[PDB]
């Protein structure tokens with residue numbers, strides 16, 4: 263049966279949630295809505311509750327609401343944010359207007375852990391291993407993050423990590439919103455594959471190893487120059503693959519530079535970490551190491567377990583190429599809310 267709801271004002275909005283969720287407290291923004299910490303009295307867990315802001319105001323909003331819910335309902339992995347609950351105060355489809363999403367509450371994000379300082383090699387091993395384990399799973403479902411960064415890697419006290427905000431994607435200037443992006447998507451070179459996320463992992467791993475942003479560009483061009491100084495200018499082979507004639511033409515105009523020595527860039531770092539970095543930070547996305555391949559790298563020998571790195575069940579995203587009206591997206595969303603079954 264339907265739980266009893268109570269009303270409360272939180273982020274200049276009235277949150278209506280089941281009684282089981284108590285002591286709601288703002289913890290900031292999430293993707294397409296604000297997030298509150300809460301105590302789930304039924305499970306004894308601290309949870310994160312995101313209220314989607316105007317989930318059905320446009321076709322774009324309605325489709326993205328459906329998109330997020332489908333993603334959350336599918337993902338069942340230790341290193342990937344999962345859905346504990348989804349609710350609406352609405353008693354019917356015609357009343358249906360608000361969507362709330364409930365996940366585990368994590369203690370911090372990876373930015374909070376970095377704090378201008380280096381981390382130990384074993385801690386870097388454990389953190390990056392978990393990211394790649396989570397990415398292997400996500401990528402196996404043909405889902406791409408596209409915007410992986412320290413702020414969407416959530417970690418608890420004992421360094422257990424979950425990936426947030428995948429499958430959904432202010433890019434101007436000296437900002438962490440662009441520092442982790444693969445150049446092929448930063449400058450719209452081509453149709454981009456899953457290893458855009460592996461570029462991001464490389465950027466994050468370097469930062470955990472040095473305590474410093476790898477490519478802190480002040481803008482798109484400055485960031486590209488920082489990147490190419492490290493990995494070298496593209497060869498003829500990659501140039502052909504740049505389907506954007508405009509992007510390719512600009513690239514060829516640049517003075518050619520050789521790849522730098524990563525051992526001279528990351529002094530004192532584990533030679534295996536350096537090796538893995540060289541395989542992640544490859545300009546040609548076709549040649550970049552994959553998550554599955556990275557997990558088998560010698561750098562993760564003490565964590566790697568081929569029988570404990572699962573892939574996802576088939577994920578039907580045929581809806582992505584479907585044109586529908588707001589009410590049609592809204593009804594599909596409602597069906598998904600109603601049919602939800604909580605995890606064990």
Ligand SMILES: Cc1ccc(C(=O)NC2CC2)cc1-c1cc2cnc(NC3CCOCC3)nc2n(C)c1=O
Nearest residue numbers: 292310312333363366367368369370371426427428
């Ligand atoms: C509530 C929720 C629902 C959906 C998704 C999501 O990832 N959707 C795309 C489709 C996959 C993410 C969340 C989510 C969880 C969350 C958990 N803990 C914490 N803890 C915070 C403490 C303070 O430090 C930063 C982390 N912040 C969080 N945030 C911000 C969130 O957005």
